[PDB]
Amino acid sequence: HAVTITHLFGQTVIKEPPKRVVSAGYTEQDDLLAVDVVPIAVTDWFGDQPFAVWPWAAPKLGGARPAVLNLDNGIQIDRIAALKPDLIVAINAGVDADTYQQLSAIAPTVAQSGGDAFFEPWKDQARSIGQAVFAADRMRSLIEAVDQKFAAVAQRHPRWRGKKALLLQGRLWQGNVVATLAGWRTDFLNDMGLVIADSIKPFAVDQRGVIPRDHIKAVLDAADVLIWMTESPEDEKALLADPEIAASQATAQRRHIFTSKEQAGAIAFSSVLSYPVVAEQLPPQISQILGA
Numbered sequence: 001h002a003v004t005i006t007h008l009f010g011q012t013v014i015k016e017p018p019k020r021v022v023s024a025g026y027t028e029q030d031d032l033l034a035v036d037v038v039p040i041a042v043t044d045w046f047g048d049q050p051f052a053v054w055p056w057a058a059p060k061l062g063g064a065r066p067a068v069l070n071l072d073n074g075i076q077i078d079r080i081a082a083l084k085p086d087l088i089v090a091i092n093a094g095v096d097a098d099t100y101q102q103l104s105a106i107a108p109t110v111a112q113s114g115g116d117a118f119f120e121p122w123k124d125q126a127r128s129i130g131q132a133v134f135a136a137d138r139m140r141s142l143i144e145a146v147d148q149k150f151a152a153v154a155q156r157h158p159r160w161r162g163k164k165a166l167l168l169q170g171r172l173w174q175g176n177v178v179a180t181l182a183g184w185r186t187d188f189l190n191d192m193g194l195v196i197a198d199s200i201k202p203f204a205v206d207q208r209g210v211i212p213r214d215h216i217k218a219v220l221d222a223a224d225v226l227i228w229m230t231e232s233p234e235d236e237k238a239l240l241a242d243p244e245i246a247a248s249q250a251t252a253q254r255r256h257i258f259t260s261k262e263q264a265g266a267i268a269f270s271s272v273l274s275y276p277v278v279a280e281q282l283p284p285q286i287s288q289i290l291g292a
Contacts, residue, residue: 007111009100014108017134018087022080024069024117025092026102029053030271031126032089033060034142035135041067041083043093047231047265054265057273072160077102087132089127092118119207121184122270142272149279150191157283161193163224163290166200169208170230170264172242177216179209185270188278189227192286197222216244225289226250227257227282229264257285 003014011145021037023029026045029052032038038061044052051058051066067083068074075093080103088109095103095111103109110132112120123143130139154160168188180186181204182196189196199222202211211219220226230236236258239245250256259267266277 003131003134005110005128007095007113007128009104009111012104012108012110012132014087014132014134015127018085018108018132020084020086021133022069022083022085022107023066024073024075024080024088024090024095025094026273027269028125028129029091030269030273031129031139031142032133033057034272035130035133035138036060037062037133037135038062039066039089041069041080043069043071046268047261049265054267054269054274055262056277057271058271060273070229074137075099075103075230077106089129089132091128094118119185122275123184123250126272132192137273145274146188146272146279147191149276150188152230153279153283154191156192157193157287157290157292159292160290162184163194164197164222165189165194165227166197166220166223166224167267168226168228170235170259171238172229173210175213177209177211177219177245179203179211179219181209183207183209190268192283194225194286199223202268212242216242217248220245220248220250223250224255225257225286226255227267228259229267230258231261231264255289257282257289 005012021039022041023032023039024043029039029042042052052068085107088103088107090103090109090114093118100111112125126143128140130136167180179200186196199219203209203211228239263281266274
């Protein structure tokens with residue numbers, strides 16, 4: 001039975017479990033590898049990982065060495081054609097109507113389902129991948145396992161319930177703190193019993209809060225715990241050197257968590273394989289700030 005995928009740019013028919021999959025977006029390799037589909041090409045995002053596959057997903061390669069694509073200057077249409085895929089997964093790749101036509105000329109192409117051309121809700125991406133590679137039941141159990149691990153954190157830490165969190169990018173932008181707005185990207189924090197501080201709501205730009213310099217101190221001080229997606233010790237040092245961050249009660253009362261690079265990657269990938277890394281490695285850090 002062929003699978004018909006309905007997406008932003010129409011429908012894609014996938015006649016059989018595909019043997020040559022290109023992962024054209026920033027994160028889809030995690031959910032593909034999770035259901036034992038090893039892409040023939042993975043697209044790099046950040047962190048300079050071998051084959052752009054981060055450590056939580058690397059084992060599933062079974063030693064394969066996929067081609068590494070990049071989006072530095074758009075989707076690499078000719079490189080994709082040369083790989084002769086039977087399925088292109090381009091959910092998190094910035095596909096538009098023009099690039100959709102180009103990819104579809106090469107092979108059946110699964111695009112995003114809606115208005116997010118990058119970073120659509122992680123479970124929507126997972127379910128679509130699962131359908132596309134004839135692994136829906138397996139992908140369903142893996143999504144459930146994520147929710148269960150975060151629910152188990154909540155059960156072990158009832159004192160956290162209602163405590164206020166912010167999830168911040170690891171670097172300032174042109175002087176501004178950049179927060180993740182409340183949405184699918186913060187559901188994992190809610191699943192552990194935390195609330196997203198509403199101090200960021202007035203500063204919305206698309207899915208982030210871009211905090212004006214004169215509001216940094218008050219906005220950070222609204223939170224009980226601040227999770228910064230730092231990718232190096234230099235990132236942490238630059239945040240603590242910022243005069244507004246340095247003068248906040250968040251700094252005075254040691255409310256900051258600065259992620260390791262691996263932790264920042266696991267949050268950023270938000271996948272069936274990366275979220276269990278967050279559920280393992282973030283709770284001990286939250287306990288140090290909130291108490292167990």
